[PDB]
C-alpha cells in the first residue's frame, strides 16, 4: 500500500519522491478556508482510485460538464471548443478520483464538500481539488504498470502551518 501525504505544497510518495502540489482557488489556498466551497481540500484521509479508465465521461458538452468517475481518467482536451477550451484547461490532462476514507474526513465541513480529484493542470490553483506536478502521473504509471497484485493508494491531507497551500504548480 502507498500512503501519500499532502501538506498544502508537497505531495509525498514515501520512498519515491516529492511532487509540487496546490489546492484551492487563488484566494482560498489556506488551511483556515478549507470549509469554503472550492477552497483547500479538507484535512483527513482519502482513497485514490488509480485504475486507468481512459477518457472521462462528458455529462454535458454545451456546458463543458464532465461526469464523475471513480478511477484515473483523461480529459478530452483535443475536442474542446469555445468555452470548454477555458474550463477544461483547469482540469489538465489527467485526473484521479479521491473519496473520503473515514467518517471524520467525510463529516468535515458539515459534509458539504466533495467531488475531489488529483489532477495535472498547470494553473497554480485548483477548484477544490489537488493540482499536482504532471510528472506524478508518469511516476505513477511506471511504478504500477509492472506490478501484478493489489495496488492500494491513499492520501493523508494535513496542514501543519498556516502557509499558503500552493506548491508552485503554475507553469514556469
Amino acid at each position: 500500500a502507498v500512503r501519500l501525504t499532502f501538506d498544502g505544497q508537497k505531495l509525498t510518495w514515501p520512498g519515491i519522491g516529492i511532487f509540487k502540489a496546490t489546492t484551492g482557488l487563488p484566494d482560498l489556498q489556506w488551511p483556515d478556508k478549507q470549509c469554503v466551497p472550492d477552497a483547500a481540500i479538507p484535512e483527513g484521509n482519502y482513497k485514490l482510485f488509480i485504475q486507468f479508465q481512459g477518457e472521462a465521461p462528458i455529462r454535458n458538452a454545451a456546458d463543458c460538464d464532465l461526469g464523475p468517475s471513480w478511477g484515473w481518467s483523461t480529459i478530452p482536451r483535443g475536442q474542446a471548443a469555445g468555452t470548454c477550451e477555458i474550463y477544461w484547461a483547469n482540469w489538465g490532462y489527467n485526473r484521479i478520483r479521491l473519496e473520503s476514507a473515514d467518517e471524520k474526513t467525510r463529516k468535515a465541513c458539515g459534509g458539504k464538500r466533495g467531488g475531489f480529484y488529483i489532477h495535472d493542470s498547470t494553473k497554480g490553483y485548483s477548484h477544490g481539488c489537488i493540482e499536482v506536478e504532471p510528472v506524478f502521473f508518469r511516476i505513477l504509471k511506471q511504478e504500477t504498470e509492472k506490478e501484478n497484485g493489489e495496488k492500494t493508494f491513499t492520501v493523508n491531507v494535513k496542514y501543519v502551518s498556516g502557509q499558503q497551500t500552493n506548491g508552485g504548480t503554475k507553469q514556469g
Binding site: 456546458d63 463543458c64 460538464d65 464532465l66 474550463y87 483547469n90 482540469w91 464538500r113 466533495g114 467531488g115 480529484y117 477548484h127 477544490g128 481539488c129
Partner: peptide, 4 residues
C-alpha cells in the same frame, strides 16, 4: 460537485 462541479468544478467550473
Amino acid at each position: 460537485h462541479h468544478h467550473h
